[PDB]
Nucleic acid binder design. Structure first.
Ligand SMILES: Nc1ncnc2c1ncn2[C@@H]1O[C@H](COP(=O)(O)OP(=O)(O)O)[C@@H](O)[C@H]1O
Ligand code: SF4
Ligand code: SF4
Ligand SMILES: [Mg+2]
Ligand SMILES: [Mg+2]
Ligand SMILES: [Mg+2]
Ligand SMILES: [Mg+2]
Ligand SMILES: [Mg+2]
Ligand SMILES: [Mg+2]
Ligand SMILES: [Mg+2]
Ligand SMILES: [Mg+2]
Ligand SMILES: [Mg+2]
Ligand SMILES: [Mg+2]
Ligand SMILES: [Mg+2]
Ligand SMILES: [Mg+2]
Ligand SMILES: [Mg+2]
Ligand SMILES: [Mg+2]
Ligand SMILES: [Mg+2]
Ligand SMILES: [Mg+2]
Ligand SMILES: [Mg+2]
Ligand SMILES: [Mg+2]
Ligand SMILES: [Mg+2]
Ligand SMILES: [Mg+2]
Ligand SMILES: [Mg+2]
Lengths: 134, 184, 258, 582
RNA sequence: GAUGAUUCAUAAUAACUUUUCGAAUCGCAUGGCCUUGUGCUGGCGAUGGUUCAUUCAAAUUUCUGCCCUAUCAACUUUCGAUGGUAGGAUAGUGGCCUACCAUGGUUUCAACGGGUAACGGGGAAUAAGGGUUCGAUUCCGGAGAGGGAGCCUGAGAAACGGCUACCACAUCCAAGGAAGGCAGCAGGCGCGCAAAUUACCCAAUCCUAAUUCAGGGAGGUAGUGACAAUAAAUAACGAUACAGGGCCCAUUCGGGUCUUGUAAUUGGAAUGAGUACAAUGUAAAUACCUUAACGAGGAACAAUUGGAGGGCAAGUCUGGUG
RNA sequence: UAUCUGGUUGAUCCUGCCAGUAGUCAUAUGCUUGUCUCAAAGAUUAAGCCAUGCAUGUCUAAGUAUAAGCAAUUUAUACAGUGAAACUGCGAAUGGCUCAUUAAAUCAGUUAUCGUUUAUUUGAUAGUUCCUUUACUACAUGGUAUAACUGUGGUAAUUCU
């Protein structure tokens, strides 16, 4: 860690989405990048809100190093952050948990399989459970 | 579908392939400026042809004409800004008299050589390409960079390199490793 | 074929929205509303591309569903609701009030207005007739129908509409010496006083118009919107005041402030 | 890159009117060769299979669409999945597992159907045709990019998939036990891995009731197979393989064997199996995958099909999806009168075992068919004498067991060389069978399927008094069954001997039946044998004893089972006629 | 009252109707005033509904403009061809159709026929100026869903991931019967000189729906990809041996400074291609950008493709054939 | 970026063609192939034929819920939370693909509807119906079904019923 000197820029307060949105410019000489979590900690001490109310993304590192430029959001509370931030960024921060899902094809196969049945399907099921005798 | 990406071609080969005068001219240019193929010279003659075509289209227009004034001042301004066109010669007739050595003196390769950080155009080429050069505070490794004549004061070695300091490099650190190995 | 279209490709969208040609195949097709889809501005492109209050259409929908924005005093939680010329847009968080007026480059401007001015709008009457049971009405340029109007109001006049009620406060007639706004065509965005109008029975009445720097031009009567008498307008004009500096004067003015 | 040949259709080729434009056009005919032989009087144009380069010029130059280009199997040197070794068997494609569904593999034995399942299970990681330097999983997955198999193989590395195979070799599994010795049940008990009550009770379905208490080694091949299925079914696994489940099973068990495998199916689960019997596959598989290629040289997996279309393609031998023809179109007194152990009374009943005219002898699984054949060979005597020693037996065990370091051709010297006359004698019978290939190979690492074929030839050799072929249906493909039945038939006319064949199949039985020893009786509890009843009568009795009815296919005469309650099935019980072509 | 203009908007009268519509609907909040009954009264919505206007559209329509061909000079007209009058049908205008009537309508200024390896346009390539050739294909319009024809539902379809029949293919079958339509996305056969993965995802762009939430092979993402297009490595620098100018010298063939290039002469520096912690990237990854650790120097990390009579750069060669 | 050159003769000057020369969001093919960005891609021949899977569905405080579904109560013995099925309502006429047909046809620019249909959106807009009009009655609110469900079944088989 060598003097990352995080500077927020182009700041604008958005009360419609209950946040502040800004471009973050970080100078990190003698160092590869700066990680998003350490960015969030430093921005959390700059705007004094919490860590779980700040969000960063963007972050292309400049050619030749020494600089990366990204986008930040601090929120008005972590409640408002959990109601407006996208879920992929919440599970990236560890605020939500990645719901385990079947794959997209398997869901589509199951939906087309249920398209062929009319109603609950209990009568067809009991008919095959009877005709297991014959 | 999405909007197509525009692209254009940036050079043009000459009409007669084998003519001894033009061959000896382009080899003199390539040797004096440290170029790798004839495509670079064709690129500059294409750019100069486009500039001359715009200036030819404006000089047919009469003077005091609003298009001629606007685009002549803009073209003259871009040429005096990149340093291809001198400060006194600013009259759109000197624009026509330009030639490819005026453009070739402004590349980062020959500027690094003229500032004297290089000792050759070929050393300048490899110094640029191997990232020991920084025109602002930003590394440039493109030899055809066309410095803009207030950037000439700021061409210097990169901070994150040897020759600008703070860590030697792979083969130096290896040789130091061998000599510290022999000491212990 | 076979019915109405529901999509709108990018590169087919109106050019004054200033949507960049990359980042997507589609543009937000304006839904049916008070304005024609070419001379309109959807709330998604106003909230995202002009005010930068959102980064996604998903965020524009998130803004809209908590009933923050309202347009002409009604809430309008629709993503592609066509906001058009002279519409007021109220953002109660930040207590902001915009009016959609053109800048002289021909694009919709971010014209912040005060809270007293957000209480009204102007409308150009498009037809006056008698409805059922002999009740007269006018139809303004954004399709509002107003019953029992003043008998002096003929077509191509401007009526001041109250926007809490739908009532008419006052009205500006159409003759020489009237301040106009050009909404349509090549001269879109310019403000000038009308000098005279050309009869042309059979189609496309022309009107001659000169701005404050005494530059004349002419426009069809379809694209002219009277906004008051010379001197005072009935609304606040945006920055520039519809002057149309040439490109020579424009880079001279840019080299002043640079 | 497949070899292309022009076939001419008998329909819509009319040489009298055609002006023989196919013949004039042909380049190979121009070079001199008689690639197409056709004259105006001729019935049909003939195109030589080996003198056609498959250019396709003839197809364009015909007044009628009588000519058509098809492909032929060939070595491809491309898209290889696996080579065992240098100059070894090559597996080109890999079947794609389908979720929720049964996917059947059909082909000649030795084509790589078993190789596919091991690869899918993870047992045999593919080398993509690099035996010398096998690629690691990182490289295999990148080969599979653009396919469902990439995601499927990635999951296996992450232990997201559990895949179990049911071995095709019944014989190997008794040798290897959890312990030194154990009975059947305690093997099941520890690896039940499923509550007995809540899931459907496979043990009741798989007819394992009595045999929970026997030691594993005593079990015959017939019982053992239903035990092998039971070990796979008790497992909780994401993917389920079943190699050759039909083997050593009678008709009622095979339908139940079809029933058990499908019951495993779930949306998450995968079920893929290689079954040879066509008739069971109707009730076994949603989808059918044909494998083809010269045996033990190369094998190519094809696109799947639905069963009804899939099976009909296999019988036809011409896949239409890929325009190739893979060319497999299917078309005296001895009154022993008792034997006991005290537990399973196989009371025999009198027979006039006929002269020189082949007989089936057909039972059920626990019905103790082998005891009679053990008793015709002198062994397993009756307690209270009345044992006739007259007959001399060339039998062949059901559990054939290798004990010697023998190359085949030397085993040809050791017992069966005999006189080896060229006409109608052991030289003639061998020619259809592919035993000419296997002479070099060692019998110990001769394949199980091929080991059956060597035993069949081995047993037929010594005439003795009576060869008794025991159960020759196992470990043979469909085509090999047709060849084997005829090769038995042609031989057994020439010798004035008889044979009691111990089939658990039915269709080969019906082809190789003149008189039928029936075996009515409870299985795996005291039976009762009967007399060698005549053909129409004897199938029907056994068919009565199971409530199974068979229908004669109109086009191809293939015997297909009926549904348990259906119009034909009801009609044939009422008419009394459970079978046809008597 | 309007329009350039109306038998227009609108109003009135007399009837008509087989009689259209004129709320038996849903959610939150739950007040106000009383002779106190479960009294009267009342907010913000949601859905529906007649008519007009508006918007998204549609259907017709005016003017002008299309490649080659006269080895196409006359074409249309009982079966509508051109017009007239009435009707019918249509959402409406009209030979759109019918009844009666008249004999018209197009054409060398190229009608009518034939051909097109012809969807039209924005546009593309190449051009000093003028042109010539192309446009299946990112946008706009049209048409089609194997070929034809017919129709249901609906605001909107002559709909094909709707139905009906015929014609052509073609599947299953227990022979009774049943089900079909990739010029969607992948993929296969065939054809050929000729063109990619039966992968991941709704994160973005937007669309649909009762709807912020669900869905989307639309669309995005990676794979394949020398179709074109941009930038741009394959070496840079010394020290010493080898082939050169006046001059310090005014010391005849002596150092040669000041350079220019060869070297079976030696030195360190420099760096990416590559590999890889990590972080960034991303829906999750891969890659790019950044970066520890490793990664160079002559048999290593080794650039080809065509040529050397002329046109047209480059042999006053050496073997082979004859 | 307004350029030519080789070949008819014993030599010459011409006519004149052939040949070279440069380009191609023109294709194909051969040889070769390190890096970054960007990118077309079964049009031509066959609008030839298709195994397999997917590509059109949809829920709000706000149409209908006694799932013999899941939850926890404590407002509420009529219901009231979440929520399958099914009915109702919308959507499936947009999108995507291709270029066979088509030569005053399509199309382009420019007009017209005073010659018409228009779901939706947005703005307006409906004291008149006790149809024989003193009750012939329900307007503090009228009648049937029918699905899902439950149960009995047929067919080899279908998104059959
Ligand atoms: N483990 C093995 N090692 C080497 N060769 C084998 C092996 N297994 C089979 N082979 C050879 O390659 C072929 C693979 O087919 P196989 O595994 O027997 O399946 P199938 O039962 O379809 O023949 C066999 O015919 C055999 O000759
Ligand atoms: S298609 Fe064959 S059979 Fe028929 S006319 Fe031609 S050559 Fe003879
Ligand atoms: S495919 Fe060619 S070689 Fe073969 S028969 Fe036809 S024309 Fe002859
Ligand atoms: Mg929209
Ligand atoms: Mg096997
Ligand atoms: Mg008429
Ligand atoms: Mg008429
Ligand atoms: Mg065509
Ligand atoms: Mg075509
Ligand atoms: Mg199109
Ligand atoms: Mg259509
Ligand atoms: Mg087709
Ligand atoms: Mg149709
Ligand atoms: Mg389709
Ligand atoms: Mg396809
Ligand atoms: Mg060469
Ligand atoms: Mg040569
Ligand atoms: Mg040579
Ligand atoms: Mg030369
Ligand atoms: Mg001559
Ligand atoms: Mg001569
Ligand atoms: Mg030429
Ligand atoms: Mg469409
Ligand atoms: Mg409304």
């Amino acid at each position: 860690s060598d003097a990352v000197t995080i500077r927020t820029r182009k700041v604008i307060s958005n009360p419609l989405l209950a946040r502040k949105q800004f471009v973050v410019d970080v100078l990190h000489p003698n160092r590869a990048n700066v990680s998003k979590d350490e960015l969030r900690e430093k921005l959390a001490e700059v705007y004094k809100a919490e860590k779980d109310a700040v969000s960063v993304f963007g972050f292309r590192t400049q050619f030749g190093g020494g600089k990366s430029v990204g986008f930040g959001l601090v929120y008005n509370s972590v409640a408002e952050a959990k109601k407006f931030e996208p879920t992929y960024r919440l599970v990236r921060y560890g605020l939500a948990e990645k719901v385990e899902k079947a794959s997209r094809q398997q869901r589509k196969q199951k939906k087309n399989r249920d398209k062929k049945i009319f109603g609950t399907g209990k009568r067809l099921a009991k008919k095959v459970a009877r005709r297991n005798a014959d | 579908p999405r909007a197509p990406r525009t692209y254009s071609k940036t050079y043009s080969t000459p009409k007669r392939p084998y003519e001894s005068s033009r061959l000896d001219a382009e080899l003199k240019l390539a040797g004096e400026f440290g170029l790798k193929n004839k495509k670079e010279i064709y690129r500059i003659s294409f750019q100069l042809s486009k500039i001359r075509r715009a200036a030819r289209d404006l000089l047919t227009r009469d003077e005091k004409d609003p298009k001629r004034l606007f685009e002549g001042n803009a073209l003259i301004r871009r040429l005096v800004r990149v340093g291809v066109l001198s400060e006194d010669k600013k009259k759109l007739d000197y624009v026509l008299a330009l030639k490819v050595e005026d453009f070739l003196e402004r590349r980062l390769q020959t500027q690094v050589y003229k500032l004297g950080l290089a000792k050759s155009v070929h050393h300048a080429r490899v110094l640029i390409t191997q990232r020991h050069i920084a025109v602002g505070k930003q590394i440039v490794n493109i030899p055809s960079f066309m410095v803009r004549l207030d950037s000439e004061k700021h061409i210097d070695f990169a901070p994150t390199s040897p020759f600008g300091g703070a860590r030697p490099g792979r083969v130096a650190r290896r040789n130091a490793a061998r000599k510290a190995e022999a000491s212990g | 074929a076979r019915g109405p279209k529901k999509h709108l490709k990018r590169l087919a969208a109106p050019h004054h929205w200033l949507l960049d040609k990359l980042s997507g195949c589609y543009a937000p097709r304006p839904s049916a509303g008070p304005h024609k889809l070419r001379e309109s501005l959807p709330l998604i492109v106003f909230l995202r591309n002009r005010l930068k209050y959102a980064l996604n259409g998903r965020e524009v929908k998130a803004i809209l569903m908590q009933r923050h924005v309202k347009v002409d005093g009604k809430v309008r939680t629709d993503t592609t609701y066509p906001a058009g010329f002279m519409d007021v847009i109220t953002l109660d968080a930040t207590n902001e009030n915009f009016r959609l007026v053109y800048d002289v480059k021909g694009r919709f401007a971010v014209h912040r207005i005060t809270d007293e001015e957000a209480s009204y709008k102007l409308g150009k009457v498009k037809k006056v007739q008698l409805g059922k049971k002999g009740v007269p009405y006018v139809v303004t340029h954004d399709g509002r129908t107003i019953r029992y109007p003043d008998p002096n109001i003929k077509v191509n006049d401007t009526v001041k509409i109250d926007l809490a009620s739908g009532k008419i406060t006052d009205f500006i007639k159409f003759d020489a010496g009237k301040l106009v706004y050009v909404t349509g065509g090549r001269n879109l965005g310019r403000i000038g006083t009308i000098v005279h109008k050309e009869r042309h029975d059979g189609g496309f009445d022309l009107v001659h118009i000169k701005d404050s720097l005494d530059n004349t031009f002419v426009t069809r009567l379809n694209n002219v919107f009277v906004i008051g008498e010379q001197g005072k307008p009935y609304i606040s004009l945006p920055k520039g005041k519809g002057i149309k500096l040439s490109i020579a004067e424009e880079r001279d003015r840019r080299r002043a402030q640079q | 890159k497949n070899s292309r040949i022009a076939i001419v259709s008998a329909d819509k080729c009319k040489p009298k009117k055609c002006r023989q434009e196919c013949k004039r056009s042909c380049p190979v005919v121009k070079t001199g060769k008689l690639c197409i032989e056709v004259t105006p009087t001729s019935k049909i144009a003939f195109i030589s299979e080996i003198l056609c380069i498959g250019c396709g010029i003839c197809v364009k130059k015909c007044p009628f669409d009588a000519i058509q280009i098809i492909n032929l199997p060939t070595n491809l040197e491309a898209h290889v999945t696996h080579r065992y070794s240098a100059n070894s068997f090559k597996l080109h494609r890999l079947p794609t597992p389908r979720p929720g569904q049964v996917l059947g593999l059909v082909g000649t034995n030795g084509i790589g159907k078993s190789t596919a399942l091991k690869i899918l299970a993870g047992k045999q990681k593919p080398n993509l045709g690099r035996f010398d330097d096998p690629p690691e999983w990182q490289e295999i997955i990148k080969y599979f990019r653009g396919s469902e198999l990439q995601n499927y193989f990635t999951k296996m590395l992450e232990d997201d998939i559990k895949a179990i195979i049911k071995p095709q070799y019944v014989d190997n599994i008794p040798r290897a036990i959890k312990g030194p010795v154990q009975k059947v049940g305690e093997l099941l008990k520890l690896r039940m891995e499923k509550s007995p009550e809540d899931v459907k009770r496979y043990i009741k379905i798989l007819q394992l009731e009595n045999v929970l208490k026997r030691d594993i080694e005593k079990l015959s091949g017939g019982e053992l197979q239903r035990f092998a299925i039971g070990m796979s079914c008790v497992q909780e696994a994401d993917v389920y393989m079943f190699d050759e489940p039909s083997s050593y099973l009678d008709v009622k068990q095979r339908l139940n064997a079809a029933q058990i495998i499908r019951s495993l199916l779930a949306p998450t689960k995968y079920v893929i199996c290689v079954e040879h019997d066509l008739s069971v596959l109707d009730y076994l598989s949603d989808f059918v995958c044909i494998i083809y290629g010269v045996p033990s040289v190369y094998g190519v997996v094809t696109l799947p099909a639905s069963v009804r279309e899939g099976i009909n393609i296999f019988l036809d031998g011409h896949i239409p999806a890929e325009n190739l023809r893979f060319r497999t179109e299917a078309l005296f007194s001895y009154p022993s009168l008792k034997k006991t152990q005290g537990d399973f009374v196989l009371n025999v009943e009198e027979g006039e075992f006929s002269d020189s005219e082949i007989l089936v002898m057909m039972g059920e699984n626990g019905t103790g068919k082998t005891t009679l054949i053990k008793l015709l060979a002198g062994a397993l005597k009756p307690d209270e004498g009345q044992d006739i020693p007259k007959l001399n037996v060339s039998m062949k065990p059901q559990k054939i067991a290798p004990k010697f370091p023998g190359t085949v051709r030397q085993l040809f010297f050791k017992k069966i060389r005999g006189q080896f006359l060229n006409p109608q004698f052991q030289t003639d019978v061998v020619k259809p069978l592919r035993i000419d290939d296997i002479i070099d190979q060692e019998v110990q690492h001769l394949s199980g399927g091929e080991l059956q074929r060597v035993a069949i030839v081995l047993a037929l050799g010594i005439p003795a008094d009576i060869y008794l072929i025991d159960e020759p249906s196992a470990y043979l493909d469909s085509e090999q069954r047709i060849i084997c039945s005829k090769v038995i038939r042609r031989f057994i006319l020439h010798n004035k001997k008889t044979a009691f064949i111990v089939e658990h199949d039915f269709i080969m039985a019906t082809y190789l039946a003149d008189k039928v020893i029936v075996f009515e009786g409870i299985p795996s509890k005291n039976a009762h044998a009967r007399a060698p009843e005549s053909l129409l009568t004897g199938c029907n009795r056994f068919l009565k004893n199971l409530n199974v009815t068979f229908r004669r296919d109109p086009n191809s005469f293939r015997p297909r089972i009926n549904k348990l309650d259906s119009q034909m099935d009801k009609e044939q019980k009422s008419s009394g006629n459970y079978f046809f072509l008597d």
